[PDB]
Paper text:
The APE1N174D mutant had a kobs of 0.0026 ± 0.0010 s−1, corresponding to a 330,000-fold reduction in kobs compared to APE1WT. Next, we crystallized the APE1N174D mutant protein bound to a 21-mer dsDNA oligo containing a centrally located THF AP site analog. In these crystals, the AP site has been cleaved by APE1 resulting in a product complex that diffracted to 2.10 Å resolution in the P1 space group. Within this structure, both N174D and the AP site are positioned in the active site with clear density for the cleaved DNA backbone, however there is no metal bound. We overlayed the APE1N174D mutant product complex with the APE1WT product complex and observed similar active site conformations (RMSD = 0.335 of 2321 atoms). Consistent with what we observed for the APE1N174A mutant, residue N212 in the APE1N174D mutant failed to undergo the rotameric shift observed in APE1WT following product formation. The 5′ phosphate and 3′ hydroxyl DNA termini in the APE1N174D mutant product complex are only moderately shifted compared to their positions in the APE1WT product complex. These shifts are considerably smaller than those observed in the APE1N174A mutant product complex, supporting the idea that the N174 side chain acts as a steric barrier to keep the cleaved 5′ and 3′ DNA termini within the APE1 active site. However, given that the rate of cleavage for the APE1N174D mutant is even lower than in the APE1N174A mutant, we hypothesize the charge of the N174D mutation may account for the remaining difference in cleavage rates between our mutants. We found that a larger area of the APE1N174D mutant active site surface was more negatively charged than APE1WT.
AP sites are then processed by apurinic/apyrimidinic endonuclease 1 (APE1), which cleaves the phosphodiester DNA backbone at the 5′ end of the AP site using its endonuclease activity. Upon binding an AP site, APE1 flips the AP site out of the DNA double helix and into an extrahelical position within the compact APE1 active site. In the human APE1 substrate complex, N174 is within hydrogen bonding distance of N212 and the AP site bridging oxygen (O5) and deoxyribose sugar oxygen (O4). To assess the role of N174 during APE1 catalysis, we rationally designed four mutations of N174: N174A, N174D, N174Q, and N174K.
Author numbering: 43 to 318
Amino acid sequence: ALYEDPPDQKTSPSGKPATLKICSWNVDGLRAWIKKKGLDWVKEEAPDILCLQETKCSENKLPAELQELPGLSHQYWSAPSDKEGYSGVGLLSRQAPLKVSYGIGDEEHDQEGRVIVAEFDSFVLVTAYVPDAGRGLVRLEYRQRWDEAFRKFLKGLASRKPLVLCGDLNVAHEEIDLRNPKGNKKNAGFTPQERQGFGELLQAVPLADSFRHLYPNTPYAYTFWTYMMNARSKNVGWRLDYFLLSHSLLPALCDSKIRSKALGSDHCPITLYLAL
DNA sequence: CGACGGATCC
DNA sequence: GCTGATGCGC
DNA sequence: GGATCCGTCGGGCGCATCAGC
Protein backbone atom coordinates (compact mmCIF):
# COMPACT_ATOMS: atom_id res chain seq x y z
CA ALA A 1 0.00 0.00 0.00
CA LEU A 2 1.16 3.55 -0.69
CA TYR A 3 2.03 5.94 2.13
CA GLU A 4 1.08 9.54 2.85
CA ASP A 5 3.12 10.99 5.64
CA PRO A 6 0.70 12.73 8.12
CA PRO A 7 0.78 16.56 8.05
CA ASP A 8 3.68 18.26 9.92
CA GLN A 9 3.00 18.76 13.65
CA LYS A 10 5.21 21.86 14.27
CA THR A 11 4.01 21.98 17.97
CA SER A 12 4.99 19.67 20.93
CA PRO A 13 2.41 17.66 23.04
CA SER A 14 2.37 20.59 25.59
CA GLY A 15 1.61 23.16 22.87
CA LYS A 16 5.19 24.46 22.56
CA PRO A 17 6.46 25.70 19.16
CA ALA A 18 9.16 23.84 17.22
CA THR A 19 12.43 25.83 17.66
CA LEU A 20 14.62 23.28 15.80
CA LYS A 21 14.15 21.28 12.53
CA ILE A 22 16.83 18.61 11.61
CA CYS A 23 16.89 16.93 8.12
CA SER A 24 18.76 13.62 7.52
CA TRP A 25 19.20 12.28 3.96
CA ASN A 26 21.22 9.41 2.45
CA VAL A 27 21.95 11.21 -0.88
CA ASP A 28 23.56 8.09 -2.55
CA GLY A 29 26.06 10.32 -4.36
CA LEU A 30 26.06 14.05 -3.32
CA ARG A 31 27.26 15.32 -6.80
CA ALA A 32 24.54 13.23 -8.51
CA TRP A 33 21.96 14.26 -5.86
CA ILE A 34 22.69 17.98 -6.63
CA LYS A 35 22.43 17.60 -10.43
CA LYS A 36 19.08 15.81 -9.63
CA LYS A 37 17.87 19.00 -7.82
CA GLY A 38 18.29 17.86 -4.20
CA LEU A 39 19.53 21.19 -2.75
CA ASP A 40 16.32 22.81 -4.07
CA TRP A 41 14.22 20.50 -1.87
CA VAL A 42 16.55 21.42 1.09
CA LYS A 43 15.94 25.16 0.43
CA GLU A 44 12.14 24.58 0.46
CA GLU A 45 12.58 22.46 3.63
CA ALA A 46 14.71 25.17 5.35
CA PRO A 47 16.31 22.94 8.01
CA ASP A 48 18.49 24.36 10.82
CA ILE A 49 20.72 21.26 10.61
CA LEU A 50 21.11 19.05 7.51
CA CYS A 51 22.83 15.67 7.95
CA LEU A 52 23.81 13.75 4.77
CA GLN A 53 25.06 10.18 4.33
CA GLU A 54 26.77 8.31 1.43
CA THR A 55 28.19 11.54 0.03
CA LYS A 56 30.70 9.62 -2.14
CA CYS A 57 32.59 12.90 -2.43
CA SER A 58 35.75 14.26 -0.89
CA GLU A 59 35.93 17.83 0.35
CA ASN A 60 37.92 19.41 -2.49
CA LYS A 61 35.30 18.05 -4.93
CA LEU A 62 32.13 19.44 -3.27
CA PRO A 63 30.06 21.48 -5.79
CA ALA A 64 30.10 25.27 -5.17
CA GLU A 65 26.29 25.43 -4.67
CA LEU A 66 26.91 23.68 -1.32
CA GLN A 67 29.00 26.70 -0.21
CA GLU A 68 26.14 29.08 -1.22
CA LEU A 69 23.41 27.89 1.25
CA PRO A 70 23.31 30.86 3.69
CA GLY A 71 20.99 29.27 6.32
CA LEU A 72 23.38 26.23 6.43
CA SER A 73 26.81 27.98 6.41
CA HIS A 74 28.56 25.81 9.02
CA GLN A 75 29.65 22.72 7.03
CA TYR A 76 31.63 19.68 8.25
CA TRP A 77 32.54 16.71 6.00
CA SER A 78 34.08 13.23 6.55
CA ALA A 79 35.23 10.72 3.92
CA PRO A 80 37.15 7.39 3.89
CA SER A 81 40.96 7.86 4.05
CA ASP A 82 41.52 5.09 1.41
CA LYS A 83 38.23 4.26 -0.44
CA GLU A 84 37.46 7.38 -2.60
CA GLY A 85 33.91 7.22 -4.10
CA TYR A 86 32.63 5.33 -1.04
CA SER A 87 30.68 6.29 2.14
CA GLY A 88 31.10 9.89 3.33
CA VAL A 89 28.98 11.92 5.77
CA GLY A 90 28.15 15.64 6.10
CA LEU A 91 26.69 18.06 8.67
CA LEU A 92 25.50 21.52 7.55
CA SER A 93 24.25 23.82 10.37
CA ARG A 94 22.69 27.34 10.61
CA GLN A 95 24.52 27.95 13.87
CA ALA A 96 28.11 26.85 14.63
CA PRO A 97 28.29 23.80 16.96
CA LEU A 98 30.39 24.33 20.14
CA LYS A 99 32.32 21.12 19.27
CA VAL A 100 32.70 19.00 16.06
CA SER A 101 34.38 15.53 16.21
CA TYR A 102 34.67 12.56 13.77
CA GLY A 103 34.53 8.83 14.38
CA ILE A 104 33.42 6.57 17.24
CA GLY A 105 36.92 6.88 18.76
CA ASP A 106 37.95 3.43 17.47
CA GLU A 107 40.62 2.95 14.71
CA GLU A 108 39.02 -0.26 13.25
CA HIS A 109 35.75 1.64 12.70
CA ASP A 110 36.82 5.30 12.07
CA GLN A 111 38.41 4.76 8.63
CA GLU A 112 35.32 5.04 6.36
CA GLY A 113 33.97 8.58 7.18
CA ARG A 114 30.68 7.39 8.70
CA VAL A 115 30.20 9.42 11.91
CA ILE A 116 30.14 13.19 12.64
CA VAL A 117 29.47 14.32 16.29
CA ALA A 118 28.21 17.92 16.81
CA GLU A 119 27.71 19.39 20.28
CA PHE A 120 25.11 22.13 20.61
CA ASP A 121 24.10 24.05 23.78
CA SER A 122 21.14 21.86 24.81
CA PHE A 123 21.92 18.56 22.95
CA VAL A 124 24.57 16.34 21.27
CA LEU A 125 23.89 15.44 17.63
CA VAL A 126 25.42 12.34 15.95
CA THR A 127 24.90 11.58 12.23
CA ALA A 128 25.79 8.04 11.08
CA TYR A 129 26.12 5.93 7.91
CA VAL A 130 26.24 2.52 9.68
CA PRO A 131 28.21 -0.25 7.89
CA ASP A 132 26.14 -2.41 5.50
CA ALA A 133 26.25 -6.23 6.08
CA GLY A 134 26.65 -6.66 2.31
CA ARG A 135 25.36 -8.99 -0.39
CA GLY A 136 25.67 -12.56 0.95
CA LEU A 137 26.18 -11.19 4.50
CA VAL A 138 29.99 -10.92 3.84
CA ARG A 139 30.32 -7.86 6.16
CA LEU A 140 27.80 -9.03 8.86
CA GLU A 141 30.49 -9.96 11.42
CA TYR A 142 32.11 -6.52 10.90
CA ARG A 143 28.63 -4.87 11.34
CA GLN A 144 28.24 -6.75 14.64
CA ARG A 145 31.55 -5.30 15.95
CA TRP A 146 30.67 -1.81 14.65
CA ASP A 147 27.36 -2.11 16.54
CA GLU A 148 29.23 -2.97 19.80
CA ALA A 149 31.67 -0.03 19.40
CA PHE A 150 28.89 2.42 18.38
CA ARG A 151 26.69 1.40 21.38
CA LYS A 152 29.66 1.99 23.72
CA PHE A 153 30.81 5.30 22.11
CA LEU A 154 27.24 6.66 22.36
CA LYS A 155 26.48 5.51 25.94
CA GLY A 156 29.60 7.27 27.22
CA LEU A 157 29.52 10.38 24.97
CA ALA A 158 31.75 12.35 27.55
CA SER A 159 29.13 14.81 28.90
CA ARG A 160 25.48 14.60 30.08
CA LYS A 161 23.39 16.43 27.52
CA PRO A 162 20.65 14.58 25.63
CA LEU A 163 21.52 12.69 22.41
CA VAL A 164 19.97 12.94 18.96
CA LEU A 165 21.23 10.05 16.82
CA CYS A 166 20.32 10.58 13.18
CA GLY A 167 21.28 8.87 9.94
CA ASP A 168 21.24 5.59 8.01
CA LEU A 169 21.40 2.89 10.70
CA ASN A 170 21.13 0.28 7.84
CA VAL A 171 18.61 -2.06 9.69
CA ALA A 172 14.74 -2.31 9.65
CA HIS A 173 14.22 -2.80 13.46
CA GLU A 174 10.90 -4.71 13.24
CA GLU A 175 8.66 -6.35 10.57
CA ILE A 176 6.49 -3.17 10.33
CA ASP A 177 9.70 -1.41 9.07
CA LEU A 178 9.85 -3.25 5.72
CA ARG A 179 7.44 -4.45 3.01
CA ASN A 180 8.75 -8.07 2.79
CA PRO A 181 10.17 -9.09 6.21
CA LYS A 182 9.63 -12.84 5.45
CA GLY A 183 11.85 -12.91 2.31
CA ASN A 184 14.50 -10.59 3.86
CA LYS A 185 15.30 -12.24 7.23
CA LYS A 186 18.56 -13.47 5.56
CA ASN A 187 19.11 -10.20 3.56
CA ALA A 188 21.26 -7.29 4.96
CA GLY A 189 19.28 -4.90 7.22
CA PHE A 190 16.90 -7.61 8.47
CA THR A 191 19.29 -10.18 9.93
CA PRO A 192 18.32 -11.05 13.52
CA GLN A 193 21.93 -10.10 14.44
CA GLU A 194 21.41 -6.51 13.19
CA ARG A 195 17.82 -6.17 14.56
CA GLN A 196 19.06 -7.25 18.07
CA GLY A 197 21.89 -4.68 17.83
CA PHE A 198 19.35 -1.89 17.20
CA GLY A 199 17.37 -3.20 20.18
CA GLU A 200 20.47 -3.05 22.36
CA LEU A 201 21.30 0.49 21.12
CA LEU A 202 17.81 1.52 22.35
CA GLN A 203 18.14 -0.18 25.78
CA ALA A 204 21.79 0.56 26.48
CA VAL A 205 22.47 4.19 25.40
CA PRO A 206 19.50 4.61 26.01
CA LEU A 207 17.46 5.92 23.00
CA ALA A 208 13.89 6.00 21.55
CA ASP A 209 12.66 5.90 17.92
CA SER A 210 11.06 9.36 17.34
CA PHE A 211 8.87 8.07 14.46
CA ARG A 212 7.80 4.85 16.24
CA HIS A 213 7.07 6.65 19.56
CA LEU A 214 4.68 8.88 17.59
CA TYR A 215 3.39 6.26 15.09
CA PRO A 216 3.75 2.83 16.89
CA ASN A 217 1.40 0.97 14.43
CA THR A 218 1.83 3.11 11.19
CA PRO A 219 2.72 0.61 8.39
CA TYR A 220 4.21 1.27 4.89
CA ALA A 221 6.38 4.10 6.47
CA TYR A 222 9.71 3.47 4.57
CA THR A 223 12.81 5.59 3.80
CA PHE A 224 14.75 3.31 1.38
CA TRP A 225 13.54 1.65 -1.83
CA THR A 226 15.71 -0.38 -4.26
CA TYR A 227 16.13 1.27 -7.68
CA MET A 228 15.56 -2.25 -9.02
CA MET A 229 12.13 -3.25 -10.40
CA ASN A 230 11.03 0.37 -9.58
CA ALA A 231 10.31 -0.63 -5.95
CA ARG A 232 9.47 3.03 -5.14
CA SER A 233 6.41 3.03 -7.49
CA LYS A 234 4.92 0.16 -5.40
CA ASN A 235 6.30 1.42 -2.04
CA VAL A 236 8.18 -1.88 -1.49
CA GLY A 237 10.71 -0.50 0.95
CA TRP A 238 12.53 -0.39 4.27
CA ARG A 239 12.89 2.18 7.09
CA LEU A 240 16.69 2.45 7.40
CA ASP A 241 16.72 6.13 8.32
CA TYR A 242 15.87 7.25 11.83
CA PHE A 243 16.04 9.96 14.50
CA LEU A 244 16.77 8.23 17.80
CA LEU A 245 16.53 10.50 20.90
CA SER A 246 17.21 10.38 24.64
CA HIS A 247 13.93 9.98 26.64
CA SER A 248 14.65 13.45 28.09
CA LEU A 249 13.86 14.81 24.60
CA LEU A 250 10.46 13.07 24.13
CA PRO A 251 8.68 16.03 25.93
CA ALA A 252 10.32 18.23 23.20
CA LEU A 253 9.33 15.96 20.29
CA CYS A 254 6.89 17.82 18.05
CA ASP A 255 7.21 15.39 15.07
CA SER A 256 9.39 12.97 12.97
CA LYS A 257 8.61 13.00 9.24
CA ILE A 258 9.30 10.79 6.19
CA ARG A 259 9.53 12.94 3.01
CA SER A 260 8.37 10.16 0.59
CA LYS A 261 8.02 12.66 -2.37
CA ALA A 262 11.58 14.15 -2.37
CA LEU A 263 13.70 12.54 -5.13
CA GLY A 264 17.49 12.40 -5.75
CA SER A 265 18.41 9.10 -4.04
CA ASP A 266 17.16 5.53 -3.35
CA HIS A 267 16.51 7.06 0.11
CA CYS A 268 13.97 9.75 1.04
CA PRO A 269 14.73 12.61 3.43
CA ILE A 270 13.56 12.28 7.10
CA THR A 271 12.84 15.36 9.31
CA LEU A 272 12.64 15.93 13.11
CA TYR A 273 10.90 18.92 14.76
CA LEU A 274 11.99 19.75 18.36
CA ALA A 275 10.89 22.46 20.89
CA LEU A 276 13.99 23.44 22.83
C1' DC B 1 16.64 -7.57 -2.65
C1' DG B 2 12.36 -7.99 -5.64
C1' DA B 3 10.62 -11.25 -8.46
C1' DC B 4 10.12 -15.86 -9.58
C1' DG B 5 10.18 -20.77 -9.72
C1' DG B 6 10.02 -24.98 -7.45
C1' DA B 7 8.87 -27.69 -3.07
C1' DT B 8 5.93 -28.49 0.49
C1' DC B 9 1.83 -28.13 3.18
C1' DC B 10 -2.95 -29.33 4.84
C1' DG C 1 39.48 17.02 -21.10
C1' DC C 2 36.33 13.66 -22.20
C1' DT C 3 33.95 9.13 -22.94
C1' DG C 4 33.28 4.25 -22.33
C1' DA C 5 34.60 -0.34 -20.51
C1' DT C 6 35.25 -2.48 -16.33
C1' DG C 7 34.88 -3.09 -11.30
C1' DC C 8 32.82 -2.56 -6.75
C1' DG C 9 29.61 -1.49 -3.35
C1' DC C 10 25.36 -0.75 -2.23
C1' DG D 1 -4.50 -27.42 -5.52
C1' DG D 2 -4.46 -22.66 -3.06
C1' DA D 3 -1.51 -20.98 -0.03
C1' DT D 4 2.82 -20.62 1.95
C1' DC D 5 7.85 -21.41 2.38
C1' DC D 6 12.40 -20.72 0.52
C1' DG D 7 16.56 -20.68 -2.58
C1' DT D 8 18.44 -18.52 -6.99
C1' DC D 9 19.00 -15.07 -10.38
C1' DG D 10 19.66 -10.76 -12.49
C1' DG D 11 19.61 -6.24 -12.11
C1' DG D 12 19.37 -0.01 -10.93
C1' DC D 13 22.43 3.35 -9.50
C1' DG D 14 26.89 6.20 -8.31
C1' DC D 15 31.71 6.72 -8.59
C1' DA D 16 36.95 5.11 -9.55
C1' DT D 17 40.43 3.72 -12.69
C1' DC D 18 42.36 3.41 -17.09
C1' DA D 19 42.87 3.45 -21.93
C1' DG D 20 42.53 5.90 -25.98
C1' DC D 21 42.74 9.94 -28.26
